[PDB]
Ligand binder design. Structure first.
Ligand SMILES: [Zn+2]
Length: 188
């Protein structure tokens, strides 16, 4: 029986609870362990991931980015309904993608200050368990589908730089932030 409520203010905190890890760090290249229990301890980690994400001005955050080896993503990208609930994906699975390939600028909380173009399918269908353990299914397009695919990549040890086709732009953007092109990995 759940006794932790996920009711996190969308506000930056003076002292965010979890620490980010950055391109180069091996934690970002470890495929994530499946979650065995969706319980109150996990929900406290969900709250802390949200607080960390809001504090770093992000829209999505995967557990490995904060050093937590779990198939767990939080997303909150709605602009219009300011207080809409965040999307919590536990043990997600991409069922299929659809639509055309679209190229858009992406950033990442684990690669601060790097913004590069990435091509992805415009539509994704994902199955998952929510923060209450209930099975769910979602079809998404636009920014939501993009963020889902980016965050799913984190659970497989894949970073958006791995999908960047422009060598000039990749190298220039990494170098100026102290990141190494050698930390990039090919796409499976
Ligand atoms: Zn990311």
């Amino acid at each position: 029986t759940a006794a932790v409520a996920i009711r996190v203010a969308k506000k930056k905190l003076a002292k965010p609870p979890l620490d980010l890890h950055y391109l180069g760090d091996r934690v970002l290249r470890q495929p994530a362990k499946r979650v065995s229990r969706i319980d109150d301890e996990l929900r406290q980690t969900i709250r802390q991931m949200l607080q960390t994400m809001y504090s770093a001005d992000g829209i999505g955050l995967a557990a490995p980015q904060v050093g937590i080896n779990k198939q767990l993503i939080v997303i909150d990208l709605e602009l219009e309904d300011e207080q809409a609930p965040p999307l919590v994906l536990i043990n997600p699975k991409i069922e299929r993608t659809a639509g055309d390939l679209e190229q858009c600028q992406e950033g990442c909380l684990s690669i601060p200050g790097v913004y590069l173009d990435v091509e992805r399918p415009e539509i994704v269908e994902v199955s998952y368990k929510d923060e209450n353990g209930r099975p769910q299914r979602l079809v998404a397009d636009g920014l939501l589908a993009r963020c889902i695919q980016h965050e799913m990549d984190h659970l497989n040890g894949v970073l958006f730089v791995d999908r960047v086709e422009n060598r000039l732009e990749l190298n220039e953007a990494l170098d100026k932030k102290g990141f190494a092109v050698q930390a990039v990995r090919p796409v499976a």
